[PDB]
Amino acid sequence: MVDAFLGTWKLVDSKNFDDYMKSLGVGFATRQVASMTKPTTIIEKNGDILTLKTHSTFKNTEISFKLGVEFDETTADDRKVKSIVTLDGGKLVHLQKWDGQETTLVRELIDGKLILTLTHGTAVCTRTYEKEA
């Protein structure tokens, strides 16, 4: 199920993150710092509650959720959203809704790497994470 996603992951590639942030209305100064930040993402489970931590030198976030149960979230860029995370096709799909807008954060495993695809508007960003021991 979710088990192969669990652990500590480090950013090792990023494509079109500025486009994604700009689509969300993130200001230039934040985008600038974010473009040079390499987060660590930690995914943990306790029974069927998942906790997803994102740690960096700039912004930190943490969310806890049950798969398939909506939760309130305040994102790194300070959007207050209604969220749900589900497994779909073996991918961990995180959908955020606010003001009639939506964005998806889709995680999948390819060759042992965690590929995060972020879509908002027409912007599609692909971030690659590798596992840490």
Ligand X SMILES: CCCCCC/C=C\CCCCCCCC(=O)O
Residues in contact with ligand X by the rule CB under 6 A: 11, 21, 26, 30, 34, 37, 39, 41, 54, 56, 58-59, 75-77, 116, 127
Rounded to a whole number of angstroms, the minimum distance from the CB of residue 89 to ligand X is 20
128 is in an annotated binding site: yes
Q: Are 50 and 2 in contact (CB under 8 A)?
A: yes
Where residue 109 falls (left for φ over 0; alpha for ψ -120 to 50; beta otherwise) is: beta
Rounded to a whole number of angstroms, the minimum distance from the CB of residue 32 to ligand X is 10
Q: Are 76 and 58 in contact (CB under 8 A)?
A: no
129 is in an annotated binding site: yes
Q: Are 85 and 92 in contact (CB under 8 A)?
A: yes
Rounded to a whole number of angstroms, the minimum distance from the CB of residue 76 to ligand X is 4
Residue ranges with strand state E in the chain:
7-15, 40-46, 49-55, 61-66, 71-74, 80-88, 91-98, 101-110, 113-120, 123-132
| 40 vs 45, beta carbon nearer ligand X | 40
127 is in an annotated binding site: yes
Rounded to a whole number of angstroms, the minimum distance from the CB of residue 12 to ligand X is 11
Binding site per annotation, positions for hexadecanoate: 127-129
Annotated binding site: 127-129
- Residue numbers belonging to the annotated binding site for octadecanoate: 127-129
